[PDB]
Design a protein around this ligand. Structure first.
Ligand SMILES: [Cl-]
Ligand SMILES: [Cl-]
Ligand SMILES: [Cl-]
Ligand SMILES: [Cl-]
Ligand SMILES: [Cl-]
Ligand SMILES: [Cl-]
Ligand SMILES: [Cl-]
Ligand SMILES: [Cl-]
Ligand SMILES: [Mg+2]
Ligand SMILES: [Mg+2]
Ligand SMILES: [Mg+2]
Ligand SMILES: [Mg+2]
Ligand SMILES: [Mg+2]
Ligand SMILES: [Mg+2]
Ligand SMILES: [Mg+2]
Ligand SMILES: [Mg+2]
Lengths: 396, 396, 396, 396
């Protein structure tokens, strides 16, 4: 019949956060999967999915843009954010199911592949070993550990690594994340302490990385334009692949970029061409980060094409489980204007148990798989062996 | 202690949709309430509230902007929409509790009152009698019914009424709501059928209203700029108080307004100064509609002040239960640049059972009450006597 | 009755200028106070207050925004400047009275507090010891004195200090203030003499401050854009927390900022969202200085929210007596987007006599008090023991 | 010596407001006069003048731009409004004294005259007979009176007349001035009542005026852009010389003008090229009204030249006593780009007692006099025979 028979959500432990999944079944017995997230400031996604999936049962699995168009109508007043995340999760499960029904990898739905491998950067490096050492080891607790982590990235043939903001000289090594209320300092002022610790951290990272490995810096939402300018001035003489700055002020981000000696990336939290547009119109970014897990991969192709017309290259936002990596891998395979792909190389001790297939890396690149669908399936029995905790992520 | 002890949510039947409430209790035994909504495209609000309320327990009931600042940080990546609705609901319960603790009406927190009564328009008139006749009677099923409803508004001393788009000459009278997928025609094209039915409907309404009662027209998201222009051209010779058009294109809405012979209102779905700004910068609106139930009343005061500096008057978005009306009444009491207040005069047969106090109208105005807090409390036993159904509203 | 019974003004000696106060009494016997200023280019404020206070008697002390709305109407043609200062002074006395009536600190009216302490900078350092040495000692008369003053700030645990423009090598040490006609050189040209003296002064200040204490530079209205650019170029290699530039040319100030290697602050003389708007639209400032004594604290909350939407942090303009400090402290307690707070640490020998309570500093921060109202009251008998002189300030 | 020996202010009764004067005496015994106003929203002007005049004593009477430059410096932070009015009043007394010293009319200082007579409009017609009938008769209390007043203007050979907004059908004839809080309705909404009364009033005025006399409409600050558009739409088919709209929103006023079928005038409350500039840049006005009493005539020549470069003609704001008329007459004599001159033809019963010379009109034009100085002097004994009341005007 090609009809959708069921849409369910599943959830499992990912240590300091949970992973979530959409499981969509068709009348032919094909199962389409996606992975989504609530911990990154996004309570409510499951509720959105459970409501929207009710309307989808009985509809054609093949008609994903019809579903999107309908869903957009039904939730139009509160579009974006958690609503749009729910829509994107369902879209990604629909794509998997459609690809599987047609016996093709998902990139065959997205224009075909135009590359077989994708260069990555090792993200949250050494952020995961510093911030979640119970889950990702060896723990990093000092500048020597920072250096050693970069040395490890170099030895393992990774070509780039991305860090965040860390305070080294005020007690135990800790992250500086005031944009997410750790600590609660909602003005997000940047003081000397922040600047000298950024410098110390990056110098240690460069010492370990050597001169060839690229270093990316993510500042998230942790300052105002004033403070971002202060950081960029301070770090004017560093060799940075990009400095990543999230902002809801296209004019402010454009001002910062205009005064930056480094490439600026942004946009990981934005939805649709509509939200990217003011940033591109303002010349606000060198690189547009696109969250295809949030937007849905079909919607993300639209965003990539929009960026292409502005001669802006895109990078997937990818810092979740293996299924998200494979979803992003398919997007990265199809998009011409691809900057690089993000991936976390630090993995949970049970990550591989949760999925049928793991991403394969060789010489600093992700190999794009050629199996029907995204390239990996969550394993239901494994999910049940790792029951979820209450919401973590930013809401820990 | 002035600490928040608990944050709970409650839900009850409102016929074709549910009402939702936040119940916040302090260490002193004061209870602060707000009303919120999920049916207007907003699945997930309850989940957001339940997560955010966990962080609020143990904090001061007096420190509402602290809570807002913290909440904004914790959900920054997925801000707006359902996340921001959850934050606004909690804010409104905090305000009620703080006012009650200080033994004052909520307007005493908002600058004091500057008026004792607020002119209203009777909204969803005759929309509720056409679209939900099982709940709001007498049913309206033809043009004569449309005329009679306007006559009733005139007799009852209402000074203004607001209708939507109705098809009268293609079978049983029915609403035209393609922007919300009823029917599913996602291009939102406007054809002759729409135009002639708008004309027929508005002529009947004017016939009943007489020449003094003002007629407002809400087009919601039911066209593209092209179609909005077609509608405004067609209705060029009508006397309309405003034409209300929701759009996520400030440039498109500005183009429409520039070519409109009628005042244009918009913005009921927008969050914060940030989202209103592009519209004001573009000269897109005569009147800014502010949803204080969604934004929170404190945040809405910021938006009202922003509008004031642009010499734009604001109107509350108010089409829910009595508590929402009283929340909006307090906002309307304090804001200098107030255009008018929306209210639905058609009420459910059990509306008055659900709340301790009902809004009072006299000579077409809402009387602003002077009780501690918002002016009415949901009644817990009554809520339990009207158990909720599954989600309705747009998601019916 | 909650009615205002009387509005009076009082005035006392502050050495080289006078302090002024609004005293508002209610029917319940509550007294609300504010402090205002005439010496900073503002003859006439008292006359404005005395006229506007006549209309206020008999009105509710609780309805401060009603009073503001009415006052704005009555003085609309000559709004801003001295008129708006009079309105702001009355607003601040109303707020004090309302807070006292409700038995809460003024920050309880402003959203609640979100911080308990506020970092400050020691302003007019060493400006007060150079320019008014009869009142603030020890006198500073040479570069060694400049260095020693910065050393004192460091020892006393202040984290930042702010100086102005001084000429050291042309006779007795003297201020360069041509923008205020000392000397009268109304072109405001910047020559070598100015540049080399700025350098000499700042080098001495840095020598005393050490590398951790932040140095702020205030240029007031003492140049044109051309000259501001010359100064910023000259000082390109200094580590400055901000350079403060007052301008009535948003396009000119924006040009300067675009070419500045230092953060730019401005706006201390501006009134309302309306006046700040062109500067924010032009990207003219890193930091917005808000004079809440001039604007009124309620109006200033509107300005702070406007700045927040532009991701601009604000700093109070505070260089008067203890009551102004406490007024600003309450604003600073409530505003999320707070850059820092200005305060003069050099005090008159009789400052503490004039007020019931003095501001308390610890480890470079101002402690926010928790008494009803602003946190301090002028003392009537002390005011009479220090009779005012003719107008001083800029009009000396 | 050519030194200024004294600067004094005088004040006398003008019925519902006072007139004020600056009296400046030189060492040679020449007396220069100006007239200024406080009632039009401007408490404090006298205080400003008394402070600034202290600095002027001992300076050259010939150096008026030196005084202006110095005064601007000394009051720079609170410039505009009442401060700038004080400066303008002194400037106008300086000009009179300088002209008298050189034995020439003031227009000889302003480029020489380029016309001998100036067409006027009869302003506040029938506004003064309606609003201040105790002082200006015969009283106007109905539509027939409105018609008769216009007939009188026609018979007396006036070519143009200007009215305001009046409510005729809700009790005794009364002005609609919500922008100045009469009545207090601070949203400034425009309803049917306003529109139908504007129409009725203007139809009566046109009936009396005949087809040749021009009719001007002043809306002051009595609406928001929304309401101004509503008024202009309603009055689309009237033949109006201009519609006068005061606004502090250049973008809003420009929007209104863009949609106006009538010429738009504004700017009567603005100070200096700086304040006019945003309006001209926005294409906001057909005609710029310049208050030379407020700005000073020398400053006003700068504004007129600025307007000239934009191909905008200017009109003096003139609705005070005979000295203001003569001050404006001299400006009007010298400015090439002169639209028309405002004057009130309704005069107080004692107006002529107060001044040595009265303005002379012939065939609808003001004759420019050729006496040294402005053309009339206040009479000190007459001033003392008409002692002032408390402040009236808007502050009544
Ligand atoms: Cl989580
Ligand atoms: Cl902070
Ligand atoms: Cl619902
Ligand atoms: Cl369609
Ligand atoms: Cl002073
Ligand atoms: Cl000079
Ligand atoms: Cl007066
Ligand atoms: Cl109003
Ligand atoms: Mg968004
Ligand atoms: Mg990132
Ligand atoms: Mg949005
Ligand atoms: Mg609507
Ligand atoms: Mg100004
Ligand atoms: Mg300053
Ligand atoms: Mg101004
Ligand atoms: Mg006028």
């Amino acid at each position: 019949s090609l009809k959708v028979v069921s849409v369910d959500t599943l959830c499992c432990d990912a240590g300091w956060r949970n992973y979530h999944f959409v499981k969509l079944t068709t009348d032919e017995g094909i199962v389409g999967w996606s992975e989504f997230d609530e911990g990154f400031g996004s309570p409510g996604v499951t509720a959105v999915i459970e409501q929207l999936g009710k309307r989808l049962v009985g509809a054609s699995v093949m008609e994903h843009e019809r579903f999107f168009a309908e869903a957009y109508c039904l939730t139009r007043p509160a579009t974006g954010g958690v609503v749009s995340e729910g829509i994107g999760a369902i879209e990604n499960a629909l794509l998997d199911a459609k690809a599987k029904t047609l016996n093709v990898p998902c990139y065959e739905l997205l224009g075909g592949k135009l590359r077989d491998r994708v260069p990555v950067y090792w993200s949250h490096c050494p952020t995961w070993r510093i911030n979640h050492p119970k889950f990702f080891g060896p723990p990093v607790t000092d500048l020597d550990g920072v250096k050693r982590t970069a040395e490890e990235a170099r030895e393992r043939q990774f070509r780039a690594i991305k860090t965040n903001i860390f305070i080294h000289d005020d007690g135990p090594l800790h992250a500086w994340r005031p944009g997410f209320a750790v600590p609660f300092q909602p003005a997000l002022n940047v003081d000397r302490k922040v600047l000298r610790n950024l410098r110390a951290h990056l110098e240690a990272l460069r010492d370990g990385a050597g001169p060839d490995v690229e270093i990316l810096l993510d500042l998230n939402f942790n300052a105002k334009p004033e403070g971002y300018l202060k950081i960029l001035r301070e770090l004017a003489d560093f060799d940075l692949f990009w400095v990543e700055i999230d902002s809801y002020s296209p004019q402010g981000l454009a001002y910062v970029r205009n005064h930056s000696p480094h490439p600026i990336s942004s946009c990981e939290t934005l939805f649709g061409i509509r939200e990217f547009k003011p940033f591109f119109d303002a010349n606000a970014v060198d690189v547009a980060i696109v969250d295809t897990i949030w937007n849905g991969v079909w919607q993300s192709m639209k965003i990539a094409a929009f960026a292409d017309a502005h001669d802006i290259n895109v990078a997937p936002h990818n810092f979740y489980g293996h299924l998200c990596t494979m979803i992003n891998a398919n997007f990265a395979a199809a998009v011409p204007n691809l900057r690089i792909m993000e991936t976390d190389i630090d993995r949970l001790a049970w990550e591989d148990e949760l999925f049928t297939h793991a991403p394969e890396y060789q010489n600093g690149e992700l190999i794009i798989p050629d199996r029907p669908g995204w390239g990996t399936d969550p394993v239901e029995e494994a999910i049940l062996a790792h029951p979820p905790k209450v919401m973590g992520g930013l809401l820990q």
